[PDB]
Design an enzyme around this catalytic site. Sequence first.
Site, short mmCIF file in Angstrom:
data_model
loop_
_atom_site.label_atom_id
_atom_site.label_comp_id
_atom_site.label_asym_id
_atom_site.label_seq_id
_atom_site.Cartn_x
_atom_site.Cartn_y
_atom_site.Cartn_z
N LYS A 73 52.16 42.44 8.49
CA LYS A 73 50.76 42.59 8.13
C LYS A 73 50.13 43.69 8.98
O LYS A 73 50.12 43.61 10.20
CB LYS A 73 50.04 41.25 8.36
CG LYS A 73 48.54 41.25 8.03
CD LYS A 73 47.84 39.91 8.43
CE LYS A 73 46.32 40.04 8.30
NZ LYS A 73 45.59 38.77 8.11
N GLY B 59 44.61 44.20 0.43
CA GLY B 59 43.22 43.86 0.20
C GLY B 59 42.47 43.77 1.50
O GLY B 59 42.83 44.43 2.48
N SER B 60 41.43 42.94 1.52
CA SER B 60 40.61 42.73 2.72
C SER B 60 41.38 42.23 3.97
O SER B 60 40.90 42.31 5.10
CB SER B 60 39.49 41.74 2.36
OG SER B 60 38.72 42.21 1.23
N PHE B 61 42.57 41.69 3.76
CA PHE B 61 43.44 41.25 4.86
C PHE B 61 44.28 42.42 5.42
O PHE B 61 45.00 42.25 6.40
CB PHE B 61 44.38 40.14 4.37
CG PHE B 61 45.08 40.46 3.08
CD1 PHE B 61 46.26 41.18 3.07
CD2 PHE B 61 44.54 40.04 1.86
CE1 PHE B 61 46.91 41.48 1.85
CE2 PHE B 61 45.17 40.35 0.65
CZ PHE B 61 46.36 41.06 0.65
N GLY B 62 44.20 43.58 4.78
CA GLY B 62 44.99 44.74 5.15
C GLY B 62 46.13 44.93 4.17
O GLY B 62 45.98 44.63 3.00
N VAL B 63 47.28 45.41 4.65
CA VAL B 63 48.49 45.52 3.86
C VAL B 63 49.55 44.57 4.41
O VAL B 63 49.76 44.48 5.61
CB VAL B 63 49.08 46.95 3.88
CG1 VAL B 63 50.20 47.06 2.88
CG2 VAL B 63 47.99 47.97 3.55
N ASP C 209 39.60 29.86 5.47
CA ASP C 209 39.95 30.44 4.17
C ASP C 209 41.18 29.72 3.56
O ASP C 209 42.20 30.34 3.18
CB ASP C 209 40.23 31.94 4.31
CG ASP C 209 40.13 32.69 2.97
OD1 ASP C 209 39.51 32.16 2.02
OD2 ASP C 209 40.67 33.81 2.87
#
Lengths: 349, 349, 8
Positions: free
Chosen positions: B51, B31-35, B146
């Site tokens: 990550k 997602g928005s955090f990458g893979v 977050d």
Amino acid sequence: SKVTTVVATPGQGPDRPQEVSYTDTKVIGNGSFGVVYQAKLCDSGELVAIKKVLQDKRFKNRELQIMRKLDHCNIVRLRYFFYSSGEKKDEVYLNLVLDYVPETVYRVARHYSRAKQTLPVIYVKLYMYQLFRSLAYIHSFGICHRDIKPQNLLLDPDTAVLKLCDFGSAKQLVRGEPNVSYICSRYYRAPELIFGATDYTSSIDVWSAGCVLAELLLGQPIFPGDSGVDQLVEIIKVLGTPTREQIREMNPNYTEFFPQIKAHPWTKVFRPRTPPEAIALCSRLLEYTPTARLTPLEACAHSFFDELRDPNVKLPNGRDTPALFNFTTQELSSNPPLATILIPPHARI
Amino acid sequence: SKVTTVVATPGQGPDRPQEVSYTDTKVIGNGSFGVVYQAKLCDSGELVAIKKVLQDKRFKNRELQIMRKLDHCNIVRLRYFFYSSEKKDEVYLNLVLDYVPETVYRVARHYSRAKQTLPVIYVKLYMYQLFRSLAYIHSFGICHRDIKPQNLLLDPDTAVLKLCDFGSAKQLVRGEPNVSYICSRYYRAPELIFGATDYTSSIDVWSAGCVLAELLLGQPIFPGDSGVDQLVEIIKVLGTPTREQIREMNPNYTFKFPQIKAHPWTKVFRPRTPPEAIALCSRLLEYTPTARLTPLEACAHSFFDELRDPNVKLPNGRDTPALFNFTTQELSSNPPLATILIPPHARIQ
Amino acid sequence: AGGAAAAA
């Protein structure tokens, strides 16, 4: 079941209250908007919705003042209102007697999605056109809905009539007056709102409309995310990084505060079968610069809606299309010349 | 089957590259955090997480610079980092991180689906560990930004919790503006909802409070698809904020709010919720940011007394994880709280 | 920091 008789004030026209009796009261739903009931009017057997909210002693209900002014075929009509004493003891409740409509765009979309089917484009045309008309109308009063989303778009499956509902966030936006940036729902919020602008205009509704259009075409939300950051990433993946000018147009205070991604061509965002006109309309709704977005009325005139202006168009169920061309002067006021596109030669004779 | 060997810099200590070999690579999620991958290190057989995010040409990666400074038992450790190449002719930062098999989000959902709540001993353990992680990162002026159940990793057997995902983390310097669109729906402090850009690390504490309240209730305490709806839920519990409270959150809003009386917190939770749990929430979830407990004061709260008992064990008979090995860095915001935090038995020679 | 190489 119980018959309930109240003395209620007609939503429009003169303050001349009357005895209104209803029965068969069922809860439709509840939440931040209050409680929506369904009932049947004894006089006519017509089904209505009743929205009940707690009334502040210290102020006039803004939603009431707005609904009493509104009269359009694509907006739920305020039939009556009245005051009662409901759930919290010694506290006063406002009750809005509104048009009842049996479905939402949200439920219809979800049926298609679950079934791995796309909503036929004729309905995307009908529903979007009608939303844009409702937006042209309310915006002509300076009134912004501020919560345009599939749940607030009600539908009659049989006639394909769409009515905008829920004016609990609606507000007249006046140039130079600040407005709260925390309105509008997750997925549908214009980028300027995500960046915390308070000088935003009615064009936020148009962005929200564009997100609904995209979602109906894709079968899922186009800009999902549980935080503002994630939503912006999704926006940037499609629109590309915003230039410095685009950021100032959205919110001046965010000059520095993004990744550098090239725009994904809009044709690559949707399925291959998707009509080029639908895509072209999206790209003119979902623009970073608020002033660059089509107005609602210009959206109604767009080529994507040409089929609806065809004299031989019919609904799949065989019925005629609902009212599409009964434009008023109020409705047209932002751009009268579009009347020649909007009211096709065969309409209204 | 396949073995990947890379040359990587250790996360901490001197920059002397190492040859790191791993196999059995599977996607955890994206997602928005990458893979985020899982992999098995060939030598030890130990599972790790990798990550992978896209590296900007123009700037050093913020998350990397934060992760290189952090060393704490309740934060996933950066083991190695390296650069590599999905989008072609482009560079990816890879972070090799501790892997933890569960999240608080998944655990909470298992219990919620079974119509039960997590035993309190686990609420205590997990939240205590979250607060330590926060006391530490905050002692560097770093705010996670977050904090939410998905970013709290859990080992189901040892009850060790580790905070993950520092992709939104930032050093907050007083007088510097920060973006208000960070932090996830449900867990956002009111000052974020009001668009404040001068917020402090106390937003993390609000978020931690929402996590606690959620583990006690079985569902989020302040849900809503819009800011408006989240504020309404916040107001139902905390009562209407006074003007002084508004000014403390965001000065440029000193709109009018619905006038609602405070709901006594004992009424908010299920009947046998431990009263000290409820007192703790009430001191985390305050309007005024400076009135909230600091993380280190939360650790010293009476809700956590059972964890300081010398004979406390996990339900599965194992010992608790390490809870009292506080460093000077961790204690630095209030060194005399050591007198409560390190219990007498933990100071035996 | 980096540099990749695959085997089996």
